[PDB]
Write a protein that binds this ligand. Sequence first.
Ligand SMILES: *[C@@H]1O[C@H](CO)[C@@H](O[C@@H]2O[C@H](CO)[C@@H](O[C@@H]3O[C@H](CO)[C@@H](O)[C@H](O[C@H]4O[C@H](CO)[C@@H](O)[C@H](O)[C@@H]4O)[C@@H]3O)[C@H](O)[C@H]2NC(C)=O)[C@H](O)[C@H]1NC(C)=O
Lengths: 91, 141, 295
Amino acid sequence: DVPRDLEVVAATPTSLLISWEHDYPYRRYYRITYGETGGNSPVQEFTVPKDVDTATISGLKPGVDYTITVYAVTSSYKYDMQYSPISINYR
Amino acid sequence: SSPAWTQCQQLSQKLCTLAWSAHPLVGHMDLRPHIQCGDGCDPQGLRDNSQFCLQRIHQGLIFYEKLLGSDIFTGEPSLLPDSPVGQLHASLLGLSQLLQPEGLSPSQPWQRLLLRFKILRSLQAFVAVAARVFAHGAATL
Amino acid sequence: WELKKDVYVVELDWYPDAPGEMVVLTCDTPEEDGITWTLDQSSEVLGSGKTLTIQVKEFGDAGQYTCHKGGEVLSHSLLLLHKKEDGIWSTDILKDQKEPKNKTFLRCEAKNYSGRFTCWWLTTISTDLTFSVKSSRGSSDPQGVTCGAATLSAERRGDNKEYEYSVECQEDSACPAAEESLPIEVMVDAVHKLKYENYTSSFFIRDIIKPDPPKNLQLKPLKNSRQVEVSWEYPDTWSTPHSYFSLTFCVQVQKKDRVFTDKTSATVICRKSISVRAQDRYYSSSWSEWASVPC
Ligand SMILES: *[C@@H]1O[C@H](CO)[C@@H](O[C@@H]2O[C@H](CO)[C@@H](O[C@@H]3O[C@H](CO)[C@@H](O)[C@H](O[C@H]4O[C@H](CO)[C@@H](O)[C@H](O)[C@@H]4O)[C@@H]3O)[C@H](O)[C@H]2NC(C)=O)[C@H](O)[C@H]1NC(C)=O
């Protein structure tokens, strides 16, 4: 997980400040999800407007690998263009 | 006789850009006239005889300019200031003119919003075919 | 309903109460003598006569029903159960991918405009699973698409114990340059032991395109200039001719410093690292994975 396009800018023992680059102008807004890498926890999510490329993920747990994913939401139609998600694993 | 391949390539590329520049749908969501193989818009077909393909492209462009200038698009609910429909329409006109210079009803507003999405999706597919045609023609003819 | 020769699917509204459906099985024989019926490996006679009426409520009611006469086996029928819970058909077998969107069980991708694509799905289950894949373009006057056999493709300690299956399909009469009119439909029959489930996906190839990364990425020094010439090639799998199926590229040195180009070359200042990705020039679809070279 060496090069980046979604990255952790800042971090505390209970949080992560993430950042990413806009790549699909046909986006409506972004969807962020996060949960323990092992996937034994539920995966929490929130949305961000189209023009925002930064976020804070609070209340995390130390010594816990977290998989953070970001999606460029277009719509949810059977035939609308659906872009691939981008993610990283942290701590 | 030369349909100005380079200018057509540049215009068709801009049409592709415009068509994907903005998402059509609003705060709105839901889950649920084509260039065919026989139309000769494939490389081998453009090689032999390009007039067939270009006539099919011209007809498609006129088809979309008519839809974009219709009450589906003009009129309520009014298009947002970020809509590329204005520019798309002008570019469709621009291109149709370079090809041949010399010379099904909206009712409820929720139905126009969905129709606009559908037309624009179909337009994206069409313009991409046209862009590949003009790029290949520019490079090989 | 019949899912293949001698294999039946029941359809049950699954609730803790459930009266569970009356099913009439018919012995395949001419007929009306000393016929008896058994279920699975049990010798227990369930009934006699050309037909047997079963109250199908649980998996204990499914399995192989066999009819017999004069010490001979006459016919056998396998019953599977398709559960409908709170009005929705079960999806216990496959895990939801959530990748392009939510409730996403099947994920399909195409590397080019040839009518060839791949579909994949995930499961927690390793044993007694069978899948069958079918596909067509359109529903009405369906046009053929041929799929290969479904196969394990990856297996990724217990918390993260997941199996990935895949299938490759090819549209029978594909025309890569054409504007698609009707979508491709994909259907997966999943059977775990005596439990039946079905999954489906619908899409246009243009929408599932994701090119492979650019190839032969290279750095070439420039003469009376002190920056490098970055060069690369279209991937081998991409559709040809490239003069028609054009790509666009993104060059990144490591916001971080990014350049966009339709050319297969760019000139950058390599510090002490350079990445390139590709996308269809005219439609859009997903950007390819990055290709990197160290500065
Ligand atoms: C995915 O899952 C669904 C749910 O299980 C499944 O739908 C079922 O498929 C069968 C066949 O397509 C349906 O049966 C049909 O409907 C009626 C009643 O059965 C009839 O018109 C037909 O049945 C047969 O009847 C006779 C034999 O009993 C014969 O004359 C002849 O063989 C007929 O075919 C017809 O097949 C069944 O009703 C649906 N279920 C629902 C809820 O409607 C679907 O097929 C699955 N997909 C795949 C790829 O298998």
